[PDB]
Nucleic acid binder design. Structure first.
Ligand SMILES: [Mg+2]
Ligand SMILES: [Mg+2]
Ligand SMILES: [Mg+2]
Ligand SMILES: [Mg+2]
Ligand SMILES: [Mg+2]
Ligand SMILES: [Mg+2]
Ligand SMILES: [Mg+2]
Ligand SMILES: [Mg+2]
Lengths: 183, 123
RNA sequence: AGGAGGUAAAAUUCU
RNA sequence: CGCUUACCACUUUGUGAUUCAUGACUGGGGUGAAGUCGUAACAAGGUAACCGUAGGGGAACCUGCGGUUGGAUCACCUCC
RNA sequence: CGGCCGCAAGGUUAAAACUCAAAUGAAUUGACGGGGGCCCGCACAAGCGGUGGAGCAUGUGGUUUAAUUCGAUGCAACGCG
């Protein structure tokens, strides 16, 4: 029934945005941001375990992170992960703490990145929209099997529009947030 | 075969292609680090090798080995690089000259220092 | 002895 | 001297040729990984293979036609 | 790619980067064949009695467990050390 489908859409769509927002935080920024340094995987006694769980991540400044590895033995294995996450990152060890300089920001890059970002945004709007599409599909179909007044039908498809525009504007807030960084 | 033949078409020597456009066979050219990968070798070998893309003085965008154990190089580092492929990593036809411009000599080395850019330790 | 005729249905893979 | 004619450098307009670069995107390709589908080739590789050509088919490939050997097989029955 | 030829299908001419430390030929010893020949063994046939079903003894995978000690795993491990 309509009222059921609006739920399922709000949701699917929020999923869409949130998943955007995430891919975003995994991108070499202008600044620091432990968000990316998290995802990284470390070899932790055979069982892989995200670096997040073996060591603390500080912002030692704008353009340099400081990874306090709780367990000192793994220190060498942790570092290797930063270079093995292939993220253009060079982890300089120096006394119980792994310094990960954040690069300066070149021209080649800013481009490089924004184009990547803008296109991840558009892949995103595309997901949102696909949900527009099943949504209307469901309803559209509850028209025959006259289970809905032609009125009902217009109306709802409109909520779906409302939902879609909303999910999107979110997506574009996000994109803009980041675009600020890169520029 | 026939002299005759040869007079029409003299014998022509294959023209060698160099195995390294360090442009005008320069004994080594200057670069800046586009990025600093580390990849894995080929079929028989296994290790995380340390390398880096370089945007040369002559604007070629080839890639380069960073030899040795541990290097303090990154985005933007200006290096110098010499001819020397690394038959294991594909598309790595050059080495980074340790101890050159921004490149570092290798910490703690003792044997074979001149390669790897390390100063005779104050004995 | 030479000649003839006749006589297997299909059934993949393994760093 | 000035003037004026010839030749004539630069510069301009039109339309082509050529060549260097570079371009969203993209067929095909090599490499790597040793993943997915079957099992095409190597033994007669289980319908011998392959060359040319033509059609078809997710894929190796299948089928037609001619060619080539760069082809394995000659034992038992029945009769003669 | 260019040229030239063809109505077309296409042909002819004919590269380069990139990539590999091979590719290839013939002969050799084996192994192997849904190759051939000759020939063996309770291999088949021909027979007699069984297992596979049942209850139980016993071993093993498994499962469980505080522990179910370790080992043995196609034939040639499983009433095996
Ligand atoms: Mg087989
Ligand atoms: Mg298979
Ligand atoms: Mg392609
Ligand atoms: Mg076959
Ligand atoms: Mg066949
Ligand atoms: Mg034929
Ligand atoms: Mg018998
Ligand atoms: Mg029984």
């Amino acid at each position: 029934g309509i009222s059921d489908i609006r739920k399922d859409a709000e949701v699917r769509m929020d999923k869409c945005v949130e998943a955007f927002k995430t891919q975003i935080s995994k991108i070499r920024t202008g600044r620091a941001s432990p968000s990316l340094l998290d995802g990284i995987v470390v070899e932790y006694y055979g069982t892989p375990t995200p670096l997040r769980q073996l060591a603390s991540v500080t912002v030692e400044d704008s353009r340099t992170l400081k990874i306090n590895v709780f367990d000192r033995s793994m220190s060498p294995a942790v570092e290797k992960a930063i270079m093995a996450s292939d993220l253009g990152l060079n982890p300089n060890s120096a006394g119980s703490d792994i310094r990960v300089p954040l690069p300066p920001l070149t021209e080649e890059r800013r481009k490089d990145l924004t184009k990547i970002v803008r296109g991840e945004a558009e892949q995103a709007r595309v997901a949102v929209r696909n949900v527009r599409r099943d949504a209307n599909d469901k309803v559209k179909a509850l028209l025959k099997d006259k289970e809905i007044s032609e009125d009902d039908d217009r109306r709802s498809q409109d909520d779906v529009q409302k939902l879609t525009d909303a999910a999107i504007k979110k997506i574009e807030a996000a994109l803009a947030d980041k675009e600020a960084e890169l520029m | 075969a026939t002299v005759n033949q040869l007079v029409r078409k003299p014998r022509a020597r294959k023209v060698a292609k160099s195995n390294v456009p360090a442009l005008e066979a320069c004994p080594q050219k200057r670069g800046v680090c586009t990025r600093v990968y580390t990849t894995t070798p080929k079929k028989p070998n296994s290790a995380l090798r340390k390398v880096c893309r370089v945007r040369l003085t002559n604007g070629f965008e080839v890639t380069s080995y960073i030899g040795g154990e541990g290097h303090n190089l990154q985005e933007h580092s200006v290096i110098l690089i010499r001819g020397g492929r690394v038959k294991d990593l594909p598309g790595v036809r050059y080495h980074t000259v340790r101890g050159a411009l921004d490149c570092s000599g290798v910490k703690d080395r003792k044997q074979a220092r001149s390669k790897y850019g390390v100063k005779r330790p104050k004995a």
